[PDB]
């Protein structure tokens, strides 16, 4: 069981933890 993380925005601070 896993998941999927796709970074959508160009900025670095916009990403998730």
Decide: is 13 part of the binding site for its own copies (CB under 8 A).
Answer: no
Minimum distance, C-beta of residue 16 to another protein, in the bound complex (Å): 5
Residue carrying structure tokens 């925005």: 9
Minimum distance, C-beta of residue 13 to its own copies, in the bound complex (Å): 12
Q: Residue 13 touches which of another protein, its own copies, none (CB < 5 to 8 A by kind)?
A: another protein
Decide: is 10 part of the binding site for its own copies (CB under 8 A).
Answer: yes
Cα–Cα distance, 8 to 16 (Å, whole number): 10
* Residues in Cβ contact with 5 at an 8 Å cutoff, skipping those fewer than 6 apart: 16
């Amino acid at each position: 069981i896993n998941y999927t993380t796709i970074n959508y925005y160009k900025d670095s601070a916009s990403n998730a933890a």
